[PDB]
Structures are given as structure tokens and as C-alpha cells.
């Protein structure tokens, strides 16, 4: 009937036309209102292949979120290419809202309902919908924030789990709250519950062993790169936070290790930078100092971006470090169960 094709999609949202917050403002003209009663139909006796890594929806979304950022957060100075841009750079309200993606007439979105679907392969329970669920376009590295959670078990998704050049997306079942605050007016910090976080690492390790074998799993910090990827970087209240995750990724998990082994709070030191490397584009951007007052944004940890060290193959252990930087992987973590077809 149908056959795979890529085309230009549109977005839908419940944005408020009166709001000054920039996601709302963009979505008010860029997207349509959500459907009160979205329809999902089970496709009886239908089996379908998905590939979350070659899904053009991600790229379309990417170009959209770039555009959203460009027209919302104007830097005092931009160095894209060899050309430098000076301009007015006012403070704005910036807090993500959910976005749904929908197919126009003649096209459709298929949705895999298989438990813990890895994103590549045959789905046994396929449905059709007119629109996706609402996805908040949270821009961050290392940790995925405010995303979707796995239903039953932690899920690992990779193009080649044994290819150390490939990113590894992890999806949790239970979310981990992260609480950040700004009281050197650039100094800040984020708290996560130690006990809550360690239980998480134990279960992630166990899941990872199913792919790499009955081996010791080590979590360590980033080996290098720009601060945006060597720290947990994200934005809050229009301000760019950069948080040290050394306290998070500094553990060794044997096959028999449990969080119970050997305040209950891990405090991560953070910094607010005005000079940042853009994710949209190669180049540097400079913003205005941070606005006065207490800045807070409590978030839900919903996923991880990891890489695995290479080397001369050696049983016993594997070492993993936080990564990211390509925001398409953030989008993939939400769009994995969808694909576009033409009718």
C-alpha cells in the first residue's frame, strides 16, 4: 500500500498566544492547536520495521528547534563562520512546552507499541495515529531531561552497541529529580538524591551487561572536549547552566555489586557562562550577564547519553562515560517509535 518517503511535516501545540515566554511565542505562529481526542488504531496482523537512527522526522525537528532558538535567544555576539555579529541581546523568558508532530493529508505516522522496543527491527504491535504525543524540546547534554520514560525496563538504543563511535541512548523507568539553584554571581549547583541515583546506576549496569556480556561495568567522567559536553549543560530561565557530573560518574559495578554496598545527597558544582559554543551550528555566542534573583528549575532525569571506551579488547570490564552534543539524539529518544510513510 504505502511505501517509505520523507516529506515536510508541521507541528502542533497548546501554546498560549498571550504568553511572553519564547517557546509559546514561536509555537503560536509555527504550530496548530492539539486534538482533544487523538485517534490511535491498532493495525491487525501488521508487522513493520523501524529505524530510529534513519528517521527524517528527527532532522525536520532539528531544523525547527534551531529556528526556535535563533529567533528567541539573540546573543550579543555571534561567531558563525569567519563572520562576527554584534547586536542587541535582551533577556527573555525561556521554558520549553510540549510539541506534537503530525502528518498532513496523504501521509501517516506509525507507532510501535512493543514493550522496550530498541528502535531498529520488526515491531509486532503497530498502530496508526494522526499526531505524535507531546514532546518538550529540552536542549541538554549528558542527561536527557523532561523526556519520555520506558514502561517496564530500562532500554538501550544503539546503531551498533559494539561500535565505540556510536552514541548510546539510555531510557529510565523511574525518573531522578534534579534540583538546581543560583544563590561570584555566576556560581550555582544542582542536587540529586544519592540513594535514588545509585539504585538507578545498579539497574542500568545490569541492563548493559545483557549486551556486553557477564562483565564488570564502570562509569567514569568525560575524557575531554568542550565544556558543553564534558559537563551536564542545559538552559534555565534563559540562562545557560554548566554542571559537573564527576560526582555522578565515578563508580565501578561488579556483577554482584548493589547500591547498598560499603543527608543522602550528591551536590554537583555548576557554572553559568556567557560565552558558549552553539549546538545549532559551529561557532561561538556571547550573552548578557545573568538576571538578578534566585534561579531554579527542578527537572526529571529521563535518560542518558553514553559512549564506551575503545582499546585492545580485554574481557573483565567495560568503561562508560557521559557524552552527547548532537541534539538529534535527544529527539531520537522521543521519536524512535514513529516513522513517516506516504499513502
Amino acid at each position, epitope marked *: 500500500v504505502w511505501r517509505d518517503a520523507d516529506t515536510t511535516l508541521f507541528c502542533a501545540s497548546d501554546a498560549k498566544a498571550y504568553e511572553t515566554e519564547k517557546h509559546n511565542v514561536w509555537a503560536t505562529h509555527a504550530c496548530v492547536p492539539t486534538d482533544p481526542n487523538p485517534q490511535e488504531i491498532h493495525l491487525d496482523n501488521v508487522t513493520e520495521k523501524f529505524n530510529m537512527w534513519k528517521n527524517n522526522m528527527v532532522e525536520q525537528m532539528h531544523t525547527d528547534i534551531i529556528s526556535l532558538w535563533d529567533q528567541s535567544l539573540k546573543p550579543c555576539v555571534k561567531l558563525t563562520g*569567519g563572520s562576527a555579529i554584534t547586536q542587541a541581546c535582551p533577556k527573555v523568558s525561556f521554558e520549553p512546552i510540549p510539541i506534537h508532530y503530525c502528518t498532513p493529508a496523504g501521509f501517516a505516522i506509525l507507532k510501535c507499541k512493543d514493550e522496550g522496543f530498541n528502535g531498529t527491527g520488526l515491531c509486532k504491535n503497530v498502530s496508526t495515529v494522526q499526531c505524535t504525543h507531546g514532546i518538550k524540546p529540552v536542549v541538554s547534554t549528558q542527561l536527557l531531561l523532561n523526556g519520555s520514560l520506558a514502561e517496564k525496563n530500562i532500554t538501550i538504543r544503539s546503531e551498533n552497541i559494539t*561500535n*565505540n*563511535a556510536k552514541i548510546i541512548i539510555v531510557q529510565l523507568v523511574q525518573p531522578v529529580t534534579i534540583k538546581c539553584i543560583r544563590p561570584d554571581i555566576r556560581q550555582a549547583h544542582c542536587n540529586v538524591t544519592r540513594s535514588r541515583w545509585n539504585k538507578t546506576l545498579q539497574e542500568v549496569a545490569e541492563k548493559l551487561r545483557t549486551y556486553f556480556g557477564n562483565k564488570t561495568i564502570i562509569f567514569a567522567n568525560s575524557s575531554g572536549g568542550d565544556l558543553e559536553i564534558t559537563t551536564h549543560s542545559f538552559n534555565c530561565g534563559g540562562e545557560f547552566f554548566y554542571c559537573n557530573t564527576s560526582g555522578l560518574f565515578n563508580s565501578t559495578w561488579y556483577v554482584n555489586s548493589t547500591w547498598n554496598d560499603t543527608n543522602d545527597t550528591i551536590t554537583l558544582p555548576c557554572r553559568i557562562k556567557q560565552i558558549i559554543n552553539m549546538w545549532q551550528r559551529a561557532g561561538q555566542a556571547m550573552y548578557a550577564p545573568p538576571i538578578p534573583g534566585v534561579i531554579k528549575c527542578e527537572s526529571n532525569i529521563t535518560g542518558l547519553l553514553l559512549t564506551r571506551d575503545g582499546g585492545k*579488547d580485554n574481557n573483565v570490564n567495560e568503561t562508560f562515560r557521559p557524552g552527547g552534543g548532537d541534539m538529534r539524539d535527544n529527539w531520537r529518544s522521543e521519536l524512535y517509535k514513529y516513522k513517516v510513510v506516504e499513502i
Partner: antibody
Framework: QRLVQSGPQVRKPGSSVRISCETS????????LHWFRQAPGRSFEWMGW????????NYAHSFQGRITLTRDIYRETAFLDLTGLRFDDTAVYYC???????????????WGQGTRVVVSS | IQMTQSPSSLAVSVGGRVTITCRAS??????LHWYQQKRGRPPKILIH???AREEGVPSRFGGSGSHTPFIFTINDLQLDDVATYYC?????FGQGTRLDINR
């Protein structure tokens, strides 16, 4: 596509050396770059890759703590740092681009002319 | 992930059909690539994805096989083909085959 490397350098044991890999001819940000050394006669050894856009790096095995891969985003030059230069590190070092646009396949089409490194006290 | 390349050396005169075999750790599918380097020169891709050829050198060069073993074949050897050959899977390289002419 074309990758020119640094000239031959000779350093003393214990010191450190930096090798550059000048990039022209292709999209510098959308191609995973790898680093290899080749012992006199022996086959190639993998040292580590580095995704240029964010300097996202991956060192390897016995190199960790001795190697650092960086890039200068402008002038598009990539670097390879080698600290605590042992005698047996004397080799020729290579940089080679993964052919696959946006992704990895470990196909290595353009290669450096080879940076000859000698470690002699 | 772990390579074993036979033979370590070899010597065939101009014309003889050459065959190199690379065996590895369990399963790698089709992700084995084939190189070639001359004295004092950096290597060059010849065959990728276990079977496929690439632009440049002729298609008298070839490869076939699946799973664990693979074969690299030169149907009609010339004079400038005399070089060392290597098989590679991601981070892992073959030991290397030093080609030669017979005499």
C-alpha cells in the same frame, strides 16, 4: 578531501609531543576523525577518535592519561598530544577521516602523509 | 575486534590470482574493510562492507564471504600492486600480508 599532517619531529623520553592534522576539502564538522600509529614494520594501532564539532573524544587502552585529542575549530586543524614519551612510542602517526557523512562506518579514505616521531635521549 | 590474517607473507609473479583470508573473533557480519600500503606511504581503502568495491582502483579487486571468514582477491596481478595488504574491522587491524613477486 585532504589531510595534511605535521612534519617529522624528534623528542626526548619523558617529554611531550604535539601532532597536527590540517583539514581541507570537506565538511570538517560532519566527519569522525581517527588516529593511528604504525610501529616500524608492525601493523596499525588505534589510538582514538574525535568528533570535531564538540571535540567529543575517545581515547583507548594504554593510551589513556598519555594522549589528548583536540581540534582548533577555526583553521579546522586537529591535534594529537602524547605525554610521557616512552622509547617504544617511536613510530609514524596517522590521522584518517571516516568516509561516512553523519555517522560511523570506519571507512578511512583520506590519510595523513604520516608524522615520523623518534623518541631518543 | 580481533584479527588473524593469512598468510603473513606471500610471493606471486605478475598475473597469478592471489587470495588472502582474514578470520576473526565470532561474528562481524560484513563490516570488514581492505587496505593497501606501499613503502613509505599511507594505506588506501580498496574494498569495504566485505564485498563492495569503491571508486578508484579497478574491480579486478574483490572480496566475498560472511560471518567469521573473508577473502580478498586479485584476479590479475600487475606490477604496481606489489604492496602490503591489511584487513580491518573498526578498531582492529589484520597482522598484514607482505606481497611479493616470484623468482
Amino acid at each position: 578531501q585532504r589531510l595534511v599532517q605535521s612534519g617529522p619531529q624528534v623528542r626526548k623520553p619523558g617529554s611531550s609531543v604535539r601532532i597536527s592534522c590540517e583539514t581541507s576539502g570537506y565538511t570538517f564538522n560532519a566527519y569522525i576523525l581517527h588516529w593511528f600509529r604504525q610501529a616500524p614494520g608492525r601493523s596499525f594501532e588505534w589510538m582514538g577518535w574525535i568528533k570535531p564539532k564538540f571535540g567529543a573524544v575517545n581515547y583507548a587502552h594504554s593510551f589513556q592519561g598519555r594522549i589528548t585529542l583536540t581540534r582548533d575549530i577555526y583553521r579546522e586543524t586537529a591535534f594529537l598530544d602524547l605525554t610521557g614519551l616512552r622509547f617504544d612510542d617511536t613510530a609514524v602517526y596517522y590521522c584518517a577521516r571516516d568516509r561516512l557523512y553523519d555517522g560511523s562506518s570506519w571507512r578511512l579514505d583520506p590519510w595523513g602523509q604520516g608524522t615520523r616521531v623518534v623518541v631518543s635521549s | 575486534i580481533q584479527m588473524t590474517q593469512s598468510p603473513s607473507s606471500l610471493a606471486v609473479s605478475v598475473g597469478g590470482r592471489v587470495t588472502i583470508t582474514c578470520r576473526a573473533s565470532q561474528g562481524i557480519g560484513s563490516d570488514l574493510h581492505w587496505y593497501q600500503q606501499k613503502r613509505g606511504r599511507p594505506p588506501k581503502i580498496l574494498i569495504h562492507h566485505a564485498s563492495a568495491r569503491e571508486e578508484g582502483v579497478p574491480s579486478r579487486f574483490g572480496g566475498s564471504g560472511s560471518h567469521t571468514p573473508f577473502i580478498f582477491t586479485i584476479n590479475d596481478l600487475q606490477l604496481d600492486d606489489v604492496a602490503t595488504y591489511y584487513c580491518q574491522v573498526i578498531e582492529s587491524f589484520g597482522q598484514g600480508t607482505r606481497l611479493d613477486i616470484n623468482r
